[PDB]
Design an enzyme around this catalytic site. Structure first.
Site, PDB file in Angstrom:
ATOM      1  CE1 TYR A  77      -3.306  -2.833   0.282  1.00 62.59           C
ATOM      2  CE2 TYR A  77      -4.039  -2.382   2.371  1.00 62.59           C
ATOM      3  CZ  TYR A  77      -3.760  -3.485   1.247  1.00 62.59           C
ATOM      4  OH  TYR A  77      -4.488  -4.130   1.407  1.00 62.59           O
ATOM      5  CE  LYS A 103      -3.930  -7.197   4.056  1.00 62.30           C
ATOM      6  NZ  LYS A 103      -4.000  -5.925   4.076  1.00 62.30           N
ATOM      7  CG  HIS A 129      -0.875  -9.068  -0.008  1.00 58.56           C
ATOM      8  ND1 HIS A 129      -0.915  -7.794  -0.126  1.00 58.56           N
ATOM      9  CD2 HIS A 129      -2.723  -8.510  -0.517  1.00 58.56           C
ATOM     10  CE1 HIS A 129      -1.460  -6.621  -0.077  1.00 58.56           C
ATOM     11  NE2 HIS A 129      -2.280  -7.130  -0.172  1.00 58.56           N
ATOM     12  CD  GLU A 179     -22.879   6.476   6.605  1.00 54.97           C
ATOM     13  OE1 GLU A 179     -22.851   7.064   6.123  1.00 54.97           O
ATOM     14  OE2 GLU A 179     -22.982   5.230   5.719  1.00 54.97           O
TER      15      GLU A 179
HETATM   16  N1  LIG Z   1      -5.803  -8.745   1.314  1.00 56.54           N
HETATM   17  C1  LIG Z   1      -6.325  -8.027   0.227  1.00 56.54           C
HETATM   18  O1  LIG Z   1      -5.917  -8.793  -0.916  1.00 56.54           O
HETATM   19  C2  LIG Z   1      -6.703  -7.418   0.223  1.00 56.54           C
HETATM   20  C3  LIG Z   1      -7.637  -6.641  -1.314  1.00 56.54           C
HETATM   21  C4  LIG Z   1      -8.772  -5.461  -1.172  1.00 56.54           C
HETATM   22  C5  LIG Z   1      -8.671  -4.266   0.408  1.00 56.54           C
HETATM   23  N2  LIG Z   1      -8.357  -5.113   1.427  1.00 56.54           N
HETATM   24  C6  LIG Z   1      -7.711  -3.881   2.741  1.00 56.54           C
HETATM   25  O2  LIG Z   1      -9.057  -4.168   2.456  1.00 56.54           O
HETATM   26  C7  LIG Z   1      -9.967  -3.066   2.450  1.00 56.54           C
HETATM   27  C8  LIG Z   1     -11.314  -3.034   2.228  1.00 56.54           C
HETATM   28  O3  LIG Z   1     -11.379  -3.188   0.150  1.00 56.54           O
HETATM   29  P1  LIG Z   1     -11.623  -1.880  -0.437  1.00 56.54           P
HETATM   30  O4  LIG Z   1     -11.251  -0.494   0.035  1.00 56.54           O
HETATM   31  O5  LIG Z   1     -10.920  -2.184  -1.475  1.00 56.54           O
HETATM   32  O6  LIG Z   1     -13.113  -1.640  -0.377  1.00 56.54           O
HETATM   33  P2  LIG Z   1     -14.167  -1.402   0.646  1.00 56.54           P
HETATM   34  O7  LIG Z   1     -13.437  -0.873   1.933  1.00 56.54           O
HETATM   35  O8  LIG Z   1     -15.351  -2.497   0.359  1.00 56.54           O
HETATM   36  O9  LIG Z   1     -14.131   0.054  -0.194  1.00 56.54           O
HETATM   37  C9  LIG Z   1     -16.370   1.636   0.144  1.00 56.54           C
HETATM   38  C10 LIG Z   1     -15.854   2.044  -0.980  1.00 56.54           C
HETATM   39  O10 LIG Z   1     -16.931   3.166  -0.898  1.00 56.54           O
HETATM   40  C11 LIG Z   1     -16.805   3.674  -0.485  1.00 56.54           C
HETATM   41  N3  LIG Z   1     -16.952   4.040   1.450  1.00 56.54           N
HETATM   42  C12 LIG Z   1     -16.923   3.784   2.458  1.00 56.54           C
HETATM   43  N4  LIG Z   1     -17.823   3.426   3.314  1.00 56.54           N
HETATM   44  C13 LIG Z   1     -18.653   4.045   2.609  1.00 56.54           C
HETATM   45  C14 LIG Z   1     -20.600   4.586   3.387  1.00 56.54           C
HETATM   46  N5  LIG Z   1     -20.514   4.150   4.589  1.00 56.54           N
HETATM   47  N6  LIG Z   1     -20.876   5.041   2.170  1.00 56.54           N
HETATM   48  C15 LIG Z   1     -20.811   4.517   1.508  1.00 56.54           C
HETATM   49  N7  LIG Z   1     -19.574   4.658   0.700  1.00 56.54           N
HETATM   50  C16 LIG Z   1     -18.584   4.228   1.655  1.00 56.54           C
HETATM   51  C17 LIG Z   1     -15.294   4.269   0.022  1.00 56.54           C
HETATM   52  O11 LIG Z   1     -15.342   5.873  -0.256  1.00 56.54           O
HETATM   53  P3  LIG Z   1     -14.582   7.005   0.173  1.00 56.54           P
HETATM   54  O12 LIG Z   1     -12.730   6.552   0.287  1.00 56.54           O
HETATM   55  O13 LIG Z   1     -14.617   8.269  -0.299  1.00 56.54           O
HETATM   56  O14 LIG Z   1     -14.972   6.742   1.386  1.00 56.54           O
HETATM   57  C18 LIG Z   1     -14.449   3.797  -0.368  1.00 56.54           C
HETATM   58  O15 LIG Z   1     -14.003   3.805  -2.146  1.00 56.54           O
HETATM   59  C19 LIG Z   1      -9.163  -2.361   2.236  1.00 56.54           C
HETATM   60  O16 LIG Z   1      -8.533  -0.295   2.957  1.00 56.54           O
HETATM   61  C20 LIG Z   1      -7.719  -2.418   2.556  1.00 56.54           C
HETATM   62  O17 LIG Z   1      -6.799  -2.517   3.600  1.00 56.54           O
HETATM   63  C21 LIG Z   1      -7.366  -6.705   1.482  1.00 56.54           C
END
Ligand SMILES: NC(=O)c1ccc[n+]([C@@H]2O[C@H](COP(=O)([O-])OP(=O)(O)OC[C@H]3O[C@@H](n4cnc5c(N)ncnc54)[C@H](OP(=O)(O)O)[C@@H]3O)[C@@H](O)[C@H]2O)c1
Length: 281
Positions: free
Chosen positions: A57, A82, A115, A244
């Site tokens: 990251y 990771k 990872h 939220e």
């Molecule tokens: N190990 C792996 O392979 C792997 C892969 C992907 C992700 N991850 C981890 O898991 C986390 C989550 O994955 P992700 O970030 O891809 O997906 P996610 O958390 O589902 O992303 C949610 C998206 O929705 C928006 N959001 C968040 N809260 C909201 C709410 N209450 N209402 C409306 N929109 C909202 C955010 O925009 P804003 O920023 O503008 O709020 C964000 O772009 C990552 O940050 C990372 O730490 C791990």
């Protein structure tokens, strides 16, 4: 008021007795520096006590500053990083871990995860994880993006069984089968892209359900995940949405809502398939 009495401490017990907060803050792509740092601070100040990052990251340092700047003791915070694919291998892992820990500016990491599975270098990479665990540089060790056959393979070649499997999980990919497998092996599941990477926050089905509780679709997803026995780590660079996402220990989804959401599954990945993703390997 006490930030202590307000903290989002609801946790699940990992197989080794460590308590891990069921709600964490995702850091994927928060921009190293002020952005990531400030967003992480908003989270910690909002009550979050679980933070998820990764070498890849490129923002571990920002995470560290936030941790060193918030007014909460290291002991009350759960920090996860990771091992990126390019660093798999015993000696390569130990070196990667040092780089990560030095950027986080910490004395120990709460959870360290491989990872991606890759092809045939995770078993070796694991020995290094068990080494770091034995020495207490990390209080728990786990895996990420492992399918059931990947774990079966690791369980035949390890001294300590993984304690966590972080996988893509949301309404369009509920992972019920992998969750069941992991539970059978006493492996906790953490859901990444729990809000479908933002592509499900306006789903009419989810919003409708949320309307019955004065909750948003996003809050419904997170609650659905928590009640399913999984840990969730939503990310956001928006202060209001961070707060939220944390307001989910207020209500409870009914058995009907849960069945409705489970019914949304489409086997759809927003991310890559562990079986084929070989970047940097
Ligand atoms: N190990 C792996 O392979 C792997 C892969 C992907 C992700 N991850 C981890 O898991 C986390 C989550 O994955 P992700 O970030 O891809 O997906 P996610 O958390 O589902 O992303 C949610 C998206 O929705 C928006 N959001 C968040 N809260 C909201 C709410 N209450 N209402 C409306 N929109 C909202 C955010 O925009 P804003 O920023 O503008 O709020 C964000 O772009 C990552 O940050 C990372 O730490 C791990």
């Amino acid at each position: 008021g006490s930030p202590e009495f307000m903290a989002l401490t609801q946790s699940l017990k990992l197989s080794n007795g460590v308590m891990m907060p069921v709600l964490g803050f995702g850091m994927w792509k928060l921009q190293d520096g002020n952005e990531a740092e400030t967003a992480t601070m908003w989270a910690i100040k909002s009550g979050y006590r679980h933070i998820d990052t990764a070498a890849i990251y490129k923002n571990e340092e920002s995470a560290g500053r936030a941790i060193a700047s918030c007014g909460v003791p290291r002991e009350e915070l759960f920090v996860t990083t990771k091992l990126w694919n390019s660093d798999q291998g015993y000696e390569s892992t130990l070196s990667a871990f040092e780089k990560s820990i030095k950027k986080l500016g910490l004395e120990y990491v709460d959870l360290y995860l491989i990872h991606w599975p890759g092809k045939d270098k995770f078993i070796d990479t694991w020995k290094a994880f068990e080494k770091l665990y034995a020495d207490k540089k990390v209080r728990a060790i786990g895996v990420s993006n492992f399918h059931e056959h990947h774990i079966e393979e690791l369980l035949k070649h390890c001294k300590v069984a993984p304690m966590v499997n972080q996988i893509e999980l949301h309404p369009l990919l509920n992972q019920k089968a992998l969750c069941e497998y992991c539970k059978s092996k006493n492996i906790a599941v953490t859901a990444w892209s729990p809000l479908g990477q933002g592509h499900l926050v306006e789903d009419a089905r989810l919003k409708a359900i949320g309307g019955k509780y004065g909750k948003t679709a996003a809050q419904v997803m997170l609650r659905w995940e928590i009640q399913a026995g999984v840990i969730t780590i939503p990310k956001s660079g928006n202060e209001a949405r961070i707060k939220e996402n944390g307001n989910i220990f207020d209500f409870e989804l009914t058995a009907e809502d849960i069945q409705v959401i489970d019914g949304m599954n489409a086997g759809h990945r927003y991310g890559p398939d562990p079986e084929v993703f070989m970047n940097d390997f």
